[PDB]
Design a binder for these strands. Structure first.
Ligand SMILES: [Zn+2]
Length: 273
DNA sequence: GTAGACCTGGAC
DNA sequence: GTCCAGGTCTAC
């Protein structure tokens, strides 16, 4: 889940939990709990607190309780769902928050990569993992200038740059490949080689892509669904991600896949230079 | 930068 | 069996 997916989950989850008071927190895979490290402290501190809100920062969900904020990262397979505490759990459910009304928030994560951090609301933003995150793409804080500042200072690929949550928060493998395609820039070239024109163009495609993806409820390419278990539809608007071997939508040249910054990378060798 | 981690299930 | 994954983190 990247920004669009996490945002869609946020919108569809919030009304299902706002106003509910945590009665118990059960953890079946402690490793998911990063702070406090002692999972029993993590569980105990939240009991009695009420969910007042649900925000998003980058790819992180931010549950606003009374005193604390629960920072949750879905990683590759983390998913949430709300259901009756009287029904048997689904497979790979590693954390469950039980509310006083009998309903519960269930966190499922097949690969167990997701993480959870709990801090007082005031400390959450000045501690990891939120501390060093870059600006929000759909906000004025993210501009061509900010991209240039970081671009014209490193030799690494422009793709590694865009995947760096400290540069800008929210872009992942899918949206980085789509933005570079739409901006007509090869993923493997040095971020420092990008001209002011390309940077301005990339920034514009980044904002447009992430914005459109949000509207379409995110991209369901493998296992992503919103809190209602519903799939997004932006996958129908992908130009290159997962389309290796298929003809480019703009020029018909077969889309190609390689490895860039240690990750599957999709691009059109004609459209992107 | 870039394998190796961390983990599990799904295509071929 | 072998490869792959909407994500970082880390060790050579
Ligand atoms: Zn093309």
């Amino acid at each position: 889940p990247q920004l669009p997916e996490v945002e869609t989950i946020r919108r569809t989850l919030l009304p299902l939990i706002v106003g509910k008071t945590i009665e118990d927190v059960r953890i079946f895979w402690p490793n998911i709990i990063r702070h406090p490290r002692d999972s029993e402290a993590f569980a105990a501190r939240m009991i009695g607190q009420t969910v007042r809100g649900l925000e998003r920062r980058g790819k992180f969900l931010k549950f606003l309780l009374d005193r604390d904020a629960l920072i949750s990262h879905l990683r590759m397979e983390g998913r949430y769902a709300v259901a009756s505490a009287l029904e048997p759990l689904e497979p790979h459910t590693h954390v469950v928050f039980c509310f006083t009304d009998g309903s519960e928030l269930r966190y499922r994560d097949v690969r167990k990569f997701g993480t959870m951090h709990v801090y007082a609301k005031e400390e959450a933003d000045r501690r990891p993992p939120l501390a060093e995150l870059g600006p929000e793409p759909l906000s004025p804080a993210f501009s061509p200038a900010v991209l240039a500042e970081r671009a014209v200072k490193t030799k690494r690929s422009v793709k590694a740059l865009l995947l760096d949550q400290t540069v800008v928060a929210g872009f992942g493998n899918i949206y980085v490949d789509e933005s570079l395609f739409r901006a007509g820039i090869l993923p493997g070239r040095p971020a420092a080689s990008l001209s002011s024109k390309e940077i301005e163009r990339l920034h514009e495609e980044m904002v447009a892509t992430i914005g459109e993806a949000v509207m379409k409820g995110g991209s369901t390419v493998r296992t992503y669904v919103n809190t209602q278990g519903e799939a997004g539809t932006f996958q129908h608007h992908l130009y290159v991600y997962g389309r290796q071997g298929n003809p480019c939508k703009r020029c018909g040249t077969p889309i190609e896949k390689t490895v860039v910054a240690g990750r599957g990378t999709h691009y059109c060798p004609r459209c992107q230079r």
